[PDB]
Structure 1
Amino acid sequence: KRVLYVGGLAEEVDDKVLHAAFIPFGDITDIQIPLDYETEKHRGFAFVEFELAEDAAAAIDNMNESELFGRTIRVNLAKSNPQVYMDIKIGNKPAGRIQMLLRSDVVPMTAENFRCLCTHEKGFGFKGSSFHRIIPQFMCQGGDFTNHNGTGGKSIYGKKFDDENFILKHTGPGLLSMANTNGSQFFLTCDKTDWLDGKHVVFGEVTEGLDVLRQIEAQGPKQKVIIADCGE
Structure 2
Amino acid sequence: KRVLYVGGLEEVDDKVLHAAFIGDITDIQIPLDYETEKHRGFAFVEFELAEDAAAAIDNMNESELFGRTISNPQVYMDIKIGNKPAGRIQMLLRSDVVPMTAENFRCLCTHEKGFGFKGSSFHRIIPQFMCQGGDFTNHNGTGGKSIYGKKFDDENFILKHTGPGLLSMANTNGSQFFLTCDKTDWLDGKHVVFGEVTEGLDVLRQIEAQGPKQKVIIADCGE
Taking structure 1 as reference, are residues 167 and 148 closer, same or farther at Cα in structure 2, changes over 3 Å only? same
Task: State the SS of the aligned residue for 1:53.
Answer: coil
Unaligned runs of 5+ in 1: 74-79
Number of the residue aligned with 2:44: 47
Taking structure 1 as reference, are residues 179 and 61 closer, same or farther at Cα in structure 2, changes over 3 Å only? farther
Q: Calculate the TM-score normalised by the size of structure 2.
A: 0.73
Deviation at 1:16, TM superposition (A): 2.6
Measured in 2, the distance between the counterparts of 1:131 and 1:63 equals 39
Q: Calculate the TM-score normalised by the size of structure 1.
A: 0.70
Taking structure 1 as reference, are residues 142 and 3 closer, same or farther at Cα in structure 2, changes over 3 Å only? farther
Larger mean Cα displacement after TM superposition, 139-148 or 30-39: 30-39
Measured in 1, the distance between the counterparts of 2:46 and 2:220 equals 13
Taking structure 1 as reference, are residues 227 and 13 closer, same or farther at Cα in structure 2, changes over 3 Å only? closer
Deviation at 1:45, TM superposition (A): 28
* Cα-to-partner distance string for 1:188-218 (whole Å, 9 max, x where unaligned): 1111011011111111111211111122122
Partner residue of 2:91 out of 89, 93, 100: 100
Larger mean Cα displacement after TM superposition, 107-116 or 154-163: 107-116
CA contact (8 A) 1:136 1:218 kept: yes
Unaligned runs of 5+ in 2: none
Task: State the SS of the aligned residue for 1:214.
Answer: helix
Q: 1:102-121 maps to which residues of 2 (within 5 A)?
A: 102-121=93-112
Taking structure 1 as reference, are residues 17 and 106 closer, same or farther at Cα in structure 2, changes over 3 Å only? same
Deviation at 1:39, TM superposition (A): 27
Measured in 2, the distance between the counterparts of 1:46 and 1:130 equals 47
Task: State the SS of the aligned residue for 1:145.
Answer: coil
Q: How many residues align?
A: 223
CA contact (8 A) 1:2 1:52 kept: no
Measured in 1, the distance between the counterparts of 2:64 and 2:142 equals 51
Deviation at 1:15, TM superposition (A): 3.8
Taking structure 1 as reference, are residues 132 and 15 closer, same or farther at Cα in structure 2, changes over 3 Å only? same
Measured in 1, the distance between the counterparts of 2:140 and 2:164 equals 23
Taking structure 1 as reference, are residues 37 and 179 closer, same or farther at Cα in structure 2, changes over 3 Å only? closer
Measured in 2, the distance between the counterparts of 1:221 and 1:53 equals 52
Task: State the SS of the aligned residue for 1:150.
Answer: coil
Give the percent of matched residue pairs that are identical in Structure 1 and Structure 2.
100
Deviation at 1:88, TM superposition (A): 1.6
Deviation at 1:181, TM superposition (A): 1.2
Deviation at 1:129, TM superposition (A): 0.8
Measured in 2, the distance between the counterparts of 1:34 and 1:101 equals 16
Task: State the SS of the aligned residue for 1:205.
Answer: coil
Task: State the SS of the aligned residue for 2:105.
Answer: helix
Number of the residue aligned with 2:220: 229
Taking structure 1 as reference, are residues 64 and 109 closer, same or farther at Cα in structure 2, changes over 3 Å only? same
Taking structure 1 as reference, are residues 202 and 212 closer, same or farther at Cα in structure 2, changes over 3 Å only? same
CA contact (8 A) 1:82 1:102 kept: yes
CA contact (8 A) 2:157 2:188 kept: yes
Deviation at 1:157, TM superposition (A): 1.4
Taking structure 1 as reference, are residues 111 and 186 closer, same or farther at Cα in structure 2, changes over 3 Å only? same
Q: RMSD over aligned Cα, in angstroms? A: 8.9
Deviation at 1:141, TM superposition (A): 1.4
Deviation at 1:64, TM superposition (A): 9.1
Measured in 1, the distance between the counterparts of 2:50 and 2:204 equals 22
CA contact (8 A) 2:81 2:207 kept: yes
